[PDB]
């Protein structure tokens, strides 16, 4: 897409924050200024960080920006990234974007940060097995299926997520750097052939047992599983309970709505030292 | 997140100097760590790092084998070590930080230091 014609920025741009953007980057007095294609031909990197934009409307006029500095803006929707085909490094934590397939044809984007959007559907994702960082950090994912095709990936955090099945990881021998706390992990073993692992964060799950009957004698295998499957030991159990390996065991004359145990296991993998650290919950029915 | 910088100085050609880096206050679990370099007027690049927490580090091609960096992971603090020191090497440093290394690379979402004065005079 082109400008035939020289034509002022807010015309071009129709989001007042970003036609100041452009104003500003191109070194231009006002936004009603006349700008040309070459002009916007000639723009590779954007920094527009926390300037309270709604749209990038426009930036399809601009084929060469390889650099997308959006962190902490009010989009909605990328549709105007879609054809940006030297886009290498993109960064929009903080906003409410949702439609991944609009990348799709990104082939050069070796980067992609989108923390704290609101994302629960990553399987538009498919489309850019290039990746080589990928950002996901406190959103709402449960299903990270596709990653198994992100086989580029050296970086890769999907902390602050509600993920328990972590197998699409298990074939991503690149992965350098892997950060998974705060999510619902209980079994390590999809990372166990992640040999060149430097980085590794498994702090703070939060395991969610399938809810089971109260008895005054409770009895719940422990299900949380190393690398090799072995079982890791509860430190912490409520209600007093007790480890008898594989199952905790409570006596619980009064009826309550849940029991809990908390672990902590320091894990090698590669050169990674991590701390897997959990809580698992077993809600009861009365 | 505040850096805390020391060590730089004046050294003549062939010699060796320090530079040291702390990171205080709200600091992630593991982070990357080092220095960008810049001559007044002249484009910043970046020296070296490591991955504060893990091992991986990353030099510019012109210091590889001159300069090493390490840390000291209880006290939250890297270290360059700068030998065999050319005039080329006359700087600020500038000791910067991100949590991710490959965004660490770009400058642009860094937390920065000061900077400390090198020079390596003839």
């Known amino acids: 897409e082109t400008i035939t014609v020289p034509t002022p920025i807010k015309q071009i741009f129709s989001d007042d924050a970003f036609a100041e953007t452009i104003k500003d980057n191109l070194k231009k007095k006002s936004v009603t200024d006349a700008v040309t294609q070459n002009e916007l031909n000639s723009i590779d990197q954007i920094i527009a960080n926390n300037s309270d934009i709604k749209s990038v409307q426009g930036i399809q006029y601009l084929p060469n920006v390889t650099k997308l500095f959006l962190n902490g803006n009010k989009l909605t929707d990328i549709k105007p990234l879609a054809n940006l085909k030297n886009l290498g490094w993109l960064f929009l934590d903080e906003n409410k974007v949702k439609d991944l397939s609009s990348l799709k044809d990104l082939k050069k984007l070796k980067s992609l940060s989108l923390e704290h959007n609101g994302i629960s559907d990553i399987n538009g994702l498919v489309h850019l097995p290039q990746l080589e960082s990928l950002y996901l950090g406190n959103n709402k994912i449960t299903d990270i299926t596709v990653l198994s095709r992100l086989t580029k990936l050296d970086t890769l955090s999907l902390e602050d997520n509600q993920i328990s099945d972590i197998v699409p990881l298990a074939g991503l021998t690149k992965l350098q750097n892997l950060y998974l706390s705060k999510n619902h992990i209980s079994d390590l073993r999809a990372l166990a052939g992640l040999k060149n692992l430097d980085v590794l964060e498994l702090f703070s799950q939060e395991c969610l047992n399938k809810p089971i009957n109260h008895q005054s004698n409770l009895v719940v295998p422990n299900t949380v599983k190393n690398t090799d499957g072995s079982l890791v030991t509860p430190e912490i159990i409520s209600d007093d309970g007790d480890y008898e390996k594989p199952n905790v065991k409570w006596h619980l004359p009064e009826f309550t709505n849940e029991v809990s145990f908390i672990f902590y296991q320091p894990v090698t993998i590669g050169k990674a030292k991590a701390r897997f650290h959990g809580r698992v919950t077993q809600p009861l029915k009365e | 997140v505040k850096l805390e910088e020391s060590g730089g100085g004046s050294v003549q050609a062939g010699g060796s100097l320090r530079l040291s880096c702390a990171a205080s206050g709200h600091t992630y679990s593991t982070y990357c760590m080092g220095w960008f370099r810049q001559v007044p007027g002249k484009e910043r690049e970046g020296v070296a790092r490591?991955?504060?927490?893990?091992?991986?580090?990353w030099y510019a091609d012109s210091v590889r084998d001159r300069f090493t960096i390490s840390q000291d992971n209880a006290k939250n603090t890297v270290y360059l070590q700068m030998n065999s020191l050319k005039l080329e090497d006359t700087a600020i440093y500038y000791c910067?930080?991100?949590?991710?290394?490959?965004?660490?690379?770009?400058?642009?979402?860094?937390?920065w230091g000061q900077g400390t004065q090198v020079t390596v005079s003839s």
């Open positions: 910067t930080l991100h949590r991710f290394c490959n965004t660490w690379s770009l400058g642009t979402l860094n937390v």
């Open positions: 490591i991955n504060v927490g893990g091992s991986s580090t």
